[PDB]
Ligand binder design. Structure first.
Ligand code: CLA
Ligand code: CLA
Ligand code: CLA
Ligand code: CLA
Ligand code: CLA
Ligand code: CLA
Ligand SMILES: C=Cc1c(C)c2cc3nc(c4c5[nH]c(cc6nc(cc1[nH]2)C(C)=C6CC)c(C)c5C(=O)[C@@H]4C(=O)OC)[C@@H](CCC(=O)OC/C=C(\C)CCC[C@H](C)CCC[C@H](C)CCCC(C)C)[C@@H]3C
Ligand SMILES: CCCCCCCCCCCCCCCCCC(=O)OC[C@H](CO[C@@H]1O[C@H](CO)[C@H](O)[C@H](O)[C@H]1O)OC(=O)CCCCCCCCCCCCCCCCC
Ligand SMILES: CCCCCCCCCCCCCCCC(=O)OC[C@H](COP(=O)(O)OC[C@@H](O)CO)OC(=O)CCCCCCCCCCCCCCC
Ligand SMILES: CC1=C(/C=C/C(C)=C\C=C\C(C)=C/C=C/C=C(C)/C=C/C=C(C)/C=C/C2=C(C)C(=O)CCC2(C)C)C(C)(C)CCC1
Ligand SMILES: CC1=C(/C=C/C(C)=C/C=C/C(C)=C/C=C/C=C(C)/C=C/C=C(C)/C=C/C2=C(C)CCCC2(C)C)C(C)(C)CCC1
Ligand SMILES: [Fe+2]
Lengths: 31, 278, 27, 289, 40, 28, 364, 303
């Protein structure tokens, strides 16, 4: 059966974390 | 009916918190920058408690503590009493809202008796403790960092961990979390369908659940009871410090350098923390 | 050192029994 | 012998065993026995490598609250310390080796408890989310009992198996790491708070009806587990000298003087905890007779 | 435009942000940074 | 009514978010 | 002007060449102002972490969009007729003609058609429902988060690696040959045996019940006794229908050879024995170079020993040359990767592995 | 395992007490030497530490654990917690306790006799007093407290280093300063001990037996982490210099190790590992006369 919209929203919430980690890594590499 | 008695007050409390977290400053109440305007971030911003210059006066807008002025009313810190009082009023309004919803439907009000726990927590932590204290300057701030600072202050000045009431409240909170997780997991396992879970727990845990209504009552009751006891313990701290301090161990350890207990080291931490702020 | 040997054989027999039983699961 | 295995795997026993139980029961029983003995009659375990022995046994003058199975000695460090590496029993008792034995056999036992849970769940014909839920407390226990001692490089600063030991460990942890400002303890706090909230709401709803539920129960059971996973990972990160956000002295003026925020007060409180006295130039008595 | 996939409203807002809001913001910040004088 | 229920929250939020957006630049 | 901070000659340029050449020479760390060898290596290490995280995010996005807006659960029911769907189309600039034209693959909205052949790959490795695709996407998100955090952490001052740690060739070769190649291929063979083949034979195996059901009716007894030929007995028949139990064998490791009669692809049991044997070979190879236990070869001695009478000095001092130079290593790696990529293309267009992928000509 | 040693130069002595050793001191090379331990455990010797007898002294409370003993020429001082200070002018034949001032900040930690009728007094709270009246008076040298501390060590020239109560950071004091200079620890792991080497510089021992050397007076920069037990993670306790070049360290279960090149190579002495005790301190009065003090009345004498 197809995905549920709650799954999509949860996927976005989960993907929030690698965004923050990537921002931190980029700022560290900028130094 | 009362569903319109909390909406204006709750919205005003939310608006006051939002205004405080970005515009007003705690320079003249705590000597700190506590809003986005000065350069603070989401964790740092806080609606700071009023300064220790008035005592228990509520800092009304029409009261002589600000004389109708708004810049003064914000600098004196009346926004904290504003937010706290409006929030408490709206929270009791939602208590009555759940009460009247239950009355309208005709079933026993159990969402209200469960929601009573947060009411007690709020009225004890933010209202009764400063009332028992000298003034609002020792009341907790409306901020993420302010809450942590208040927690550490209460640990330093009361040894709140050693209090039986916070202990049983911790037990209640953790038991509520465990029961929530276990109920969800068992429901999605058997996904009636109670005999399978009952057999699984009878063979795993021995003391299985008699009925699903019993388990639902237990998960309803453990965290609300924990919160109620924690609030009662804080209220006691305001009146009579209920910390069982084993002075026998204290004297036994004071003059014996070959004896030590973790209670003695906790007392060491508390008294050093007291001495740290002069 | 006899206690060390005893503990060694005890734990070894326990883990060997567990793995042997798991590989021949009757049900 | 086959009758023994038939009983072991039998789903008719009064208290289930399973094949994981064959290894769970000895480890749990050993851990309980040695923990009880160490709690009752352990000698004063020196904990910091200095001449300040710490006693955590009832027979040595402790009540229930003050009793705590003392962690290992700083002399041990992180090294594996079984009894046979001790030249005699007294040194092993005085070096906190009971703590290491307890924690190791207990970790094995809880892992095997997970295994037993899953084995019974699948033999009973049920999709096993119960172990997915039970993994969270196991992960937290491993993070706070094994990962943190290794990250800190010693077993001395592990959590003592006692009520007062837990509080002292938590306070020293906050002082040395600032866990409160770390986002993962907030994730754990939100998880447990949401668990309590959902428990209360669901119990009220069910009891008020006493005479979407699938996904409702799923998320109800899933929120606290994710929170506990996140806070366990946060503790594991804190083990290797990672800390929470340090927003202190991050706001200046036109000239360069720090303004100060609530995070600055948190930092000041942490520094106050990590040294249990005042600072310098506070007028010590100059002349003593 | 609309589709039968779950959460069909997500493209409606996500695509304009990644097409207008995100590019405008990043080019603005980059232009500000690459022109800040001094501190070479 | 629904009109007030939405506008009482909408009409200050845009003002506030514009304020914070500008503060994200006013910092030296 | 501040930008570019890593070069002062470009920072004092008053023209627009400053911006162009700042973008151009950004990732050339070897010529930044005041760059040390240690800092160069550490920056390279962190950036490599970044590229790995980006790759994992890209794979997660592919999986997620396929699972969300695709037709995988209908594609499996008829791989020979249905067209795989890559992602949905949301173009406000579209007209009605384009909307009617791009409502293809039996969808209900404008939609693309995947030509990367990921549907065949997912079907071949046993993924049959889009929930599994979603779980894989979330797991890949978590993996990318972990790798980003690893880069951040190994950039920290106290976790910053030393220069000698970056110049330990023997240990790196041993670990990456035995572990990165041998262990990973062994785990892949285990995945094929424990999951992929049973799913090809119409058995649903997932995390919930893989620990119970053994891949073979005789589990681990013949492997230790030495009766390996048991695992190769009773292979899949030529009348085997992929994804069902009709005419399917019980063997897990076979050398059947050739192609599956239906899917026109290599036998999965052949893949299993192939990747397992490759794993064994790589694990043997990984124990070649001495690290600190005395046993093992040292590359410098090997190179200096293999001198030639016609080449004067032979392969003398090449160890120092390759170890000190990063461009030498990058050139060797790029040459090898290009050669094996061409090999991948040549040996995949002629020996398809994924089911029904030969029929779909556009993807090939 | 770890590399072995060519021999064992440490003669083992098992004293008749359950106390934990604290310190040792000697008046003259062959003259009676004293050692202080825990639970009022004082032992006297007459042949350079080879023969020790317990001196049974008692006060109102039997819980005055001695910490430091400092002897200059013949004059001698004993300092112990809770506050107890014995002063002698005859080498210790008779002990005259000096009642400590009630305004003493915290408990006494260590004392050093600078010469005839002098004593530099140190308290665990971080107070540096001095007497030139033989205990009649005391003069402070720092006007503030470093907080609770794990260990305090004295430099050869007179500087002081005090590790924090948990090893999170440390503090230093130089002569003429009214405060203490605090420094965050220069190691990944939490500090355990910090001492002044014979080279005039500092060294630190963190958790897990990690040893770090500083090569500058400011101690801002530090050398690489040195682990005498590479594979083993035993917790090292004390460090000392027999020679300004040779190094010795003491740990747990008799893990007494010896380095010929300033920590570069550590060879384990298997001769003394069999001792059922956790060695605590190593004191080198001279490059020939050394003592290793451990648990339950166990001593090692250098030959
Ligand atoms: C509002 C205040 C508040 C709240 C709600 C929390 C909440 C939490 N804190 Mg926290 N904290 C706070 C304030 C707060 N904190 C403050 C102010 C400080 C500073 C002192 C800290 C410092 C702090 C530390 C240092 C740590 C926490 C941790 C935690 C988490 C507990 C996880 C746990 O117990 O493991 C889950 C439960 C277990 C591991 C129990 C074992 C379960 C096993 C499987 C079963 C064992 C059975 C038993 C042995 C016998 C069976 C009984 C019977 C059958 C016989 C939780 C999210 C911990 C954490 O993050 O966890 C990783 C942690 O390490 N906090
Ligand atoms: C790199 C992988 C990748 C790529 C190329 C795409 C591509 C697309 N996604 Mg998508 N997505 C991805 C991963 C990816 N997705 C993941 C992992 C998730 C789960 C959170 C989603 C969730 C998602 C939703 C919910 C929606 C899209 C939509 C879309 C389409 C609109 C354009 C867009 O990206 O903005 C919107 C997409 C996002 C904001 C996703 C966030 C970006 C992901 C999480 C990480 C990408 C980081 C990447 C590596 C950075 C590389 C930098 C490089 C260019 C220098 C487009 C086809 C929209 C669509 O289908 O419209 C019809 C839509 O509504 N995506
Ligand atoms: C990055 C993604 C993106 C998106 C989502 C859009 C979206 C849109 N473009 Mg477009 N465009 C883009 C990139 C994009 N563009 C690029 C890169 C170019 C350069 C080649 C153009 C050049 C372009 C032109 C030249 C025109 C558009 C127009 C439009 C609109 C036509 C839809 C309609 O029915 O008109 C009516 C839509 C509305 C009434 C809704 C308005 C909604 C907001 C408030 C408008 C701002 C639509 C909002 C047309 C337009 O301006 O329409 C207004 C138009 O003439 N586009
Ligand atoms: C006016 C012309 C026009 C415009 C504006 C668009 C716009 C769009 N079409 Mg489209 N299309 C057009 C004509 C047009 N189309 C025509 C004539 C056809 C043939 C019928 C199609 C067929 C078509 C299909 C089949 C699809 C689209 C899709 C899309 C959307 C993709 C969103 C996107 O790419 O974001 C992301 C933006 C980019 C990838 C642009 C990146 C380009 C640069 C070179 C890369 C960056 C380089 C550099 C590093 C940048 C530095 C950083 C930067 C921020 C400064 C977008 C709304 C897709 C869609 O619906 O999305 C879900 C889709 O599937 N279109
Ligand atoms: C067993 C231990 C171990 C493991 C698993 C790794 C693993 C890794 N190390 Mg490594 N390393 C180790 C020990 C180890 N290391 C030690 C001990 C040292 C010190 C001496 C180092 C020092 C070191 C350095 C200095 C660097 C690494 C890097 C890397 C990464 C390389 C990125 C890559 O392409 O991987 C993925 C590779 C594969 C999966 C295999 C390659 C594929 C080949 C060509 C065959 C193709 C497979 C198949 C045919 C195609 C499949 C098709 C399918 C998609 C359908 C990788 C994750 C690099 C990095 O930055 O990572 C962060 C790097 O710069 N390592
Ligand atoms: C390399 C990855 C890998 C992993 C992680 C597993 C994991 C597993 N396999 Mg498996 N297997 C693999 C590769 C792998 N396999 C390959 C390449 C083959 C060749 C066809 C097999 C053939 C196989 C059979 C035939 C059976 C398993 C079984 C099992 C399960 C328990 C038995 C076991 O492995 O204990 C290993 C225990 C040992 C004592 C091995 C010695 C110690 C090692 C070296 C460590 C477990 C889930 C059994 C099962 O499903 O459980 C009932 C089973 O019957 N596997
Ligand atoms: C973890 C914190 C926490 C939050 C945020 C929270 C919030 C909520 N729970 C509600 C419900 C409930 N909570 C319940 C049990 C519990 N709830 C708990 C804990 C929480 N409950 C716990 C621990 C329990 C177990 C006893 C029940 C049983 C219910 C409900 O029936 C009800 C519901 O249906 O939920 C969906 C709603 C209350 C609506 C209301 O009173 O309207 C009035 C709103 C007002 C007055 C606005 C609040 C303003 C406050 C008081 C002051 C201002 C605060 C600032 C704006 C924020 C400061 C932030 C700083 C900390 C940084 C709301 C969604
Ligand atoms: C520590 C590991 C040691 C364990 C060794 C275990 C080996 C177990 C062997 C048991 C299998 C029993 C069957 C064997 C009975 C005889 C059957 C026979 O003749 O098979 C004949 C089979 C094929 O013959 C028939 O094939 C038909 C195919 O449909 C049938 O189905 C059967 O497979 C078989 O009857 O072929 C082979 O097995 C030939 C031998 C393969 C062995 C390798 C030698 C080939 C040269 C390659 C070089 C590799 C050398 C190893 C290098 C190692 C490098 C690290
Ligand atoms: C498939 C492509 C076919 C054409 C490819 C290239 C065409 C010409 C290739 C000839 C190589 C050049 C002449 C050999 C170069 C040369 O004479 O080197 C001398 C070398 C002899 O080597 P030695 O034994 O001296 O040592 C070789 C090593 O020990 C060190 O190099 O001869 C060969 O190895 C010839 C084979 C090279 C292949
Ligand atoms: C150990 C062991 C034992 C028990 C083992 C048990 C019980 C389980 C072991 C499992 C193991 C060992 C590994 C599992 C690994 C799974 C991995 C690593 C997955 C990685 C995925 C990647 C990287 C990419 C994912 C992808 C996805 C999701 C897609 O959808 C598209 C394809 C692709 C891109 C590939 C015991 C002690 C009993 C005996 C001794 C051996
Ligand atoms: C300048 C330079 C460089 C570059 C160059 C390049 C990159 C090159 C390339 C090259 C190449 C890229 C090459 C290739 C080669 C190949 C080969 C050499 C092959 C061989 C093969 C063979 C020999 C085969 C055989 C066979 C057959 C045929 C069949 C059967 C099987 C067998 C296998 C036997 C470098 C960086 C390095 C360094 C520096 C300098
Ligand atoms: Fe329920």
């Amino acid at each position: 059966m197809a995905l549920s919209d709650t799954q999509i929203l949860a996927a976005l919430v989960v993907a929030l974390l690698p965004a923050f980690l990537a921002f931190r890594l980029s700022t560290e590499l900028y130094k | 009916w009362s569903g319109l008695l909390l909406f204006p007050c709750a919205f005003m409390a939310l608006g006051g918190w939002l205004t405080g977290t970005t515009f007003v400053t705690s320079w003249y109440t705590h000597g700190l920058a506590s809003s986005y305007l000065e350069g603070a971030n989401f964790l740092t911003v806080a609606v700071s408690s009023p300064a220790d210059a008035f005592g228990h006066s509520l800092l009304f807008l029409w009261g002589p503590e600000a004389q109708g002025n708004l810049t003064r009313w914000f600098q004196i810190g009346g926004l904290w009493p504003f937010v706290a009082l409006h929030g408490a009023f709206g929270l009791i309004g939602f208590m009555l809202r759940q009460f009247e919803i239950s009355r309208l439907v005709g079933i026993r009000p159990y969402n209200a008796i469960a929601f009573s726990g947060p009411i007690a927590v709020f009225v004890s932590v933010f209202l009764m403790y400063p009332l028992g204290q000298s003034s609002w300057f020792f009341a907790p701030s409306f901020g993420v960092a302010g809450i942590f600072r208040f927690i550490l202050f209460l640990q330093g000045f009361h040894n709140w961990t050693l209090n039986p009431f916070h202990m049983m409240g911790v037990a209640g909170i953790l038991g509520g979390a465990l029961l929530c997780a276990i109920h969800g997991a068992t429901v999605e396992n058997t996904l009636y369908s109670m005999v399978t879970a009952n057999r699984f727990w009878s063979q795993i845990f021995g003391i299985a659940f008699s009925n699903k209504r019993w388990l639902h009552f237990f998960m309803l009751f453990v965290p609300v009871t924990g919160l109620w006891m924690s609030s009662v313990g804080i209220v006691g701290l305001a009146l009579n410090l209920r910390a069982y301090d084993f002075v026998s161990q204290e004297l036994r350890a004071a003059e014996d350098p070959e004896f030590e207990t973790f209670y003695t080291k906790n007392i060491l931490l508390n008294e050093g923390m007291r001495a740290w702020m002069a | 050192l006899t206690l060390k040997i005893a503990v060694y054989i005890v734990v070894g027999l326990f883990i060997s029994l567990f793995i042997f039983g798991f590989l021949s699961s009757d049900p | 012998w086959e009758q023994f295995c038939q009983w072991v795997t039998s789903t008719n026993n009064r208290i289930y065993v399973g094949w994981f139980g064959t290894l769970m029961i000895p480890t749990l029983l050993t851990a309980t026995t040695c923990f009880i003995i160490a709690f009752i009659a352990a000698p004063p375990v020196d904990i910091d490598g200095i001449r300040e022995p710490v006693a955590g046994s009832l027979l040595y003058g402790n009540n229930i609250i003050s009793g705590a199975v003392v962690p290992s000695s700083n002399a041990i460090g992180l090294h594996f310390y079984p009894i046979w590496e001790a030249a005699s029993l007294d040194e092993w008792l005085y070096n906190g080796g009971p703590y290491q034995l307890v924690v190791f056999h207990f970790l094995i036992g809880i892992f095997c408890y997970m295994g037993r849970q899953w084995e019974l769940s699948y033999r009973l014909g049920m999709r096993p989310w119960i172990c997915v839920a039970y993994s969270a407390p196991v992960s937290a226990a491993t993070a706070v009992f094994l990962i943190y001692p290794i990250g800190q490089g010693s077993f001395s600063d592990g959590m003592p198996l006692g009520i007062s030991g837990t509080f002292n460990f938590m306070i020293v942890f906050q002082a040395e790491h600032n866990i409160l400002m770390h986002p993962f303890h907030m994730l754990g706090v939100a998880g447990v708070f949401g668990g309590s909230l959902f428990s209360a709401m669901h119990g009220s709803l069910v009891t008020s009806s006493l005479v979407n539920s699938r996904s409702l129960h799923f998320f109800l059971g899933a929120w606290p587990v994710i929170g506990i996973w996140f806070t366990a990972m946060g503790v594991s990160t804190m083990a290797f000298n990672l800390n929470g956000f340090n927003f202190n002295q991050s706001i200046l003026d036109s000239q360069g003087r720090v303004i100060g925020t609530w995070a600055d007060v948190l930092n000041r409180a942490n520094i106050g905890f990590e040294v249990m006295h005042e600072r310098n130039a506070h007028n010590f008595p100059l002349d003593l007779a | 435009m609309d589709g039968s996939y779950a959460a069909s409203y997500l493209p409606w807002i996500l695509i304009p942000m990644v097409g207008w809001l995100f590019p405008a913001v990043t080019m603005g910040l980059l232009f500000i940074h690459i022109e800040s004088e001094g501190e070479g | 009514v629904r009109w007030l229920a939405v506008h009482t929250l909408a009409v200050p939020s845009v003002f506030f978010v514009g304020a914070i957006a500008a503060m994200q630049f006013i910092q030296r | 002007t501040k930008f570019p901070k890593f070069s002062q000659d470009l920072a004092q340029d008053p023209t627009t060449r400053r911006i162009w050449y700042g973008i151009a020479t950004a990732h050339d760390f070897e010529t930044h102002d005041g760059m040390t060898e240690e800092n160069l290596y550490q920056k390279i290490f962190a950036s490599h972490f970044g590229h790995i995280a980006i790759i994992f995010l890209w794979t997660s996005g592919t999986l997620f969009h396929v699972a969300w807006q695709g037709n995988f659960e209908q594609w499996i029911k008829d791989p020979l007729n249905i067209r795989p769907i890559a992602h949905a189309i949301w173009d406000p600039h579209f007209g009605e003609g384009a909307v009617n034209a791009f409502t293809q693959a039996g969808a209900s909205n404008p939609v693309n058609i995947a030509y990367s052949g990921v549907y065949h790959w997912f079907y071949t490795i046993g993924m049959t429902t889009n929930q599994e695709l979603y779980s894989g996407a979330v797991f890949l998100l978590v993996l990318a988060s972990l790798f980003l955090f690893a880069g951040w952490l190994h950039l920290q001052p106290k976790f910053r690696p030393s220069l000698a740690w970056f110049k330990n060739a023997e240990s790196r070769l041993n670990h990456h040959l035995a572990g990165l190649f041998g262990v990973s291929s062994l785990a892949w063979a285990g995945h094929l045996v424990h999951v992929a083949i049973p799913e090809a034979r119409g058995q649903h195996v997932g995390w919930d019940n893989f620990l119970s059901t053994p891949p073979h009716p005789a589990g681990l007894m013949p492997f230790f006794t030495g009766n390996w030929g048991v695992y190769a007995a009773d292979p899949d028949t030529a009348g085997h229908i992929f994804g069902t139990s009709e005419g399917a064998g019980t063997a897990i490791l076979t050398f059947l050879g050739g192609f599956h009669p239906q899917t026109e692809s290599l036998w999965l049991t052949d893949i299993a024995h192939h990747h397992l044997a490759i794993a064994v070979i790589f694990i043997i190879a990984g124990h070649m170079y001495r690290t600190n236990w005395g046993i093992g070869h040292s590359i410098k001695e090997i190179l200096n020993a293999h001198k030639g009478p016609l080449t004067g000095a032979g392969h003398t001092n090449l160890y120092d040359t390759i170890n000190n130079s990063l461009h030498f290593q990058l050139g060797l790696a790029l040459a090898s990767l290009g050669v094996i990529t061409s090999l991948v293309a040549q040996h995949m267009y002629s020996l398809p592995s994924y089911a029904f992928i030969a029929q779909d000509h556009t993807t090939q | 395992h770890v590399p072995d040693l060519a021999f064992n130069p440490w003669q083992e002595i098992a004293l008749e007490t359950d106390s934990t050793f604290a310190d040792i001191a000697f008046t003259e090379d062959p003259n009676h030497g004293w050692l202080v331990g825990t639970k009022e455990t004082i032992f006297e010797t007459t042949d350079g530490g080879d023969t020790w007898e317990q001196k049974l002294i008692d006060l109102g409370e039997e819980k005055a654990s001695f910490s430091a003993v400092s002897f200059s020429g013949n004059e001698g001082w004993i300092t112990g917690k809770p506050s107890i200070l014995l002063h002698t002018t005859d080498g210790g034949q008779t002990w005259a306790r000096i009642p400590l001032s009630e305004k003493l900040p915290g408990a006494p930690y260590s004392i050093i006799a600078l010469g005839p009728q002098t004593a530099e007094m140190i308290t665990d709270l971080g107070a540096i007093y001095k007497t030139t009246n033989g205990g009649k008076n005391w003069k402070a040298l720092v006007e503030g407290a470093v907080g609770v501390a794990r260990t305090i060590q004295r430099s050869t020239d007179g500087r002081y280093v005090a590790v924090s109560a948990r090893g999170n950071f440390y503090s230093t004091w130089a002569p003429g300063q009214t405060e203490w200079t605090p420094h965050n620890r220069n190691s990944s792991r939490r500090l355990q001990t910090m001492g002044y080497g014979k080279d005039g510089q500092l060294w630190l021992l963190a958790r897990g037996g990690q040893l770090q050397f500083s090569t500058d007076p400011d101690a801002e920069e530090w050398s690489d982490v040195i682990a005498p037990q590479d594979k083993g993670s035993w917790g090292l306790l004390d460090l000392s210099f027999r020679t300004p070049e040779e190094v010795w360290v003491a740990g747990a279960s008799g893990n007494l190790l010896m380095s010929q090149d300033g920590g570069q190579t550590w060879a384990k002495d298997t001769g003394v590992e069999d001792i059922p005790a956790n060695l605590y301190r190593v004191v080198f009065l001279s490059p020939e006369k050394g003592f290793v003090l451990g648990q339950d009345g166990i001593l090692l004498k250098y030959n």
